Amino acid sequence: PHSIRIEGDVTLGGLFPVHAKGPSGVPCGDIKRENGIHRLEAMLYALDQINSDPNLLPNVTLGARILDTCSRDTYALEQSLTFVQALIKPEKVVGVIGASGSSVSIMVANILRLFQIPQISYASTAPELSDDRRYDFFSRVVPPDSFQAQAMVDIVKALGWNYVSTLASEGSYGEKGVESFTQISKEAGGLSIAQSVRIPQERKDRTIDFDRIIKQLLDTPNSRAVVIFANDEDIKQILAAAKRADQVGHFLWVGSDSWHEDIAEGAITIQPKRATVEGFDAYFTSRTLENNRRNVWFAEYWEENFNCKLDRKCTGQERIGKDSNYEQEGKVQFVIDAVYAMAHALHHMNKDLCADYRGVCPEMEQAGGKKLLKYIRNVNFNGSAGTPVMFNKNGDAPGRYDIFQYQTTNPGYRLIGQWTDELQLNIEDMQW
Ligand SMILES: *[C@@H]1O[C@H](CO)[C@@H](O)[C@H](O)[C@H]1NC(C)=O
Ligand SMILES: [Ca+2]
Numbered sequence: 001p002h003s004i005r006i007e008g009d010v011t012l013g014g015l016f017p018v019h020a021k022g023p024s025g026v027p028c029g030d031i032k033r034e035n036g037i038h039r040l041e042a043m044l045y046a047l048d049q050i051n052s053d054p055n056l057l058p059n060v061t062l063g064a065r066i067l068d069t070c071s072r073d074t075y076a077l078e079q080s081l082t083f084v085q086a087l088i089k090p091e092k093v094v095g096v097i098g099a100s101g102s103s104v105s106i107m108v109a110n111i112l113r114l115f116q117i118p119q120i121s122y123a124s125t126a127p128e129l130s131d132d133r134r135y136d137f138f139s140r141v142v143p144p145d146s147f148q149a150q151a152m153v154d155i156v157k158a159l160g161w162n163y164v165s166t167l168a169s170e171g172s173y174g175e176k177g178v179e180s181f182t183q184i185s186k187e188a189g190g191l192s193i194a195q196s197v198r199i200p201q202e203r204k205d206r207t208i209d210f211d212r213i214i215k216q217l218l219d220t221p222n223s224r225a226v227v228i229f230a231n232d233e234d235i236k237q238i239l240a241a242a243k244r245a246d247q248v249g250h251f252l253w254v255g256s257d258s259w260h261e262d263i264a265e266g267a268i269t270i271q272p273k274r275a276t277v278e279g280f281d282a283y284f285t286s287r288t289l290e291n292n293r294r295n296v297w298f299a300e301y302w303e304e305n306f307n308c309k310l311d312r313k314c315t316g317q318e319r320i321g322k323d324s325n326y327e328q329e330g331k332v333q334f335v336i337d338a339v340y341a342m343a344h345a346l347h348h349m350n351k352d353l354c355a356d357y358r359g360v361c362p363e364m365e366q367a368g369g370k371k372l373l374k375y376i377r378n379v380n381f382n383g384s385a386g387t388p389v390m391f392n393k394n395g396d397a398p399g400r401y402d403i404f405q406y407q408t409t410n411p412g413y414r415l416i417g418q419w420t421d422e423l424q425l426n427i428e429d430m431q432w
């Protein structure tokens, strides 16, 4: 109902959107099965892995205080005060994993700075978080969208889409993405923005006409492509409308939280490199109501996931993946790697400040978050998908993206390239 509290020598805070935003006056709405429950469980799995690992924090157990953000920055701010109760068996929190949404992470980062508590996000890509003046204690295992914007300009230019229109969801994400993309395009040369269209907020009183919006973009003079900065709901409707359109277009889209469908052939997207962590699937799919009381939200997840109540009644014999559809949520790798980054930082701090000791020294206990922050910023290790985890001077993961195209040759998103220190576009793998 409230929180997951796990005792340990040092305690990690966690922030996840276990629930969506509630109706209007209510803070919390429905369970978010993938973005909330899978991500939370990824942290719990990571802690279990570290706590059984004899070569990482050999004599130091990791505990946790994991809280629900209800996808609201105000609610998360209030929750975050739990992490400082020892200062103001009182819980002393050395670092925080989260939040998910960028607005949530920003708000959280503002309070955690004041108490010198380092934070590592597994999903927040807002460029403003890279500014170490305002967000010195904030790091992230995902890259900022500033890198993504450059990659988009690079792809658009390489494909010869020298006149484009932009389409963005209403909100600060879409506005920021378009101004960022626009600014980079001005600096690059050979790329002109024909028009910028904004999608209205999804009000219950109306139904947005995506067919009209797409038709107008495809009839714009000069425009070779549409570049899309979208939320989850908007992207699904935009690409369905694109598929239904009278004319074929070129589409490049970013945003959403994903990693039968109605998607226009050849639509391109660019998203941070990630992969399935197989050990997590075995853990998560074997969870039951009997063996997973640790997750205090798991009974609610169960009722939603199997459409039953504890009006079909839950038996407890339902199994994840058998009686429901299961695919690993795309950011599980990042949650795990955030937790491992914190652990590697603590391991090195312990080895530098301590020796031959059961648990944490007074010297390590006295080091504080400013010092742990430096250790965090200097970690360098192979993460849960066998790829390197590190941060730049601003606390940002390097810009490493895969490029996908939706294909109907023989149907789904296919890997057609990547953007790292170079742009690799495999023109031979693309549909023409
Ligand atoms: C952990 O405990 C063992 C046995 O007491 C000891 O040899 C080792 O030095 C300890 N490690 C650390 C990092 O304190
Ligand atoms: Ca250990």
Ligand SMILES: [Ca+2]
Pocket (backbone or CB within 6 Å): 129, 130, 131, 132, 135, 136, 137, 138, 139, 394, 395, 396
């Ligand atoms: Ca930062």
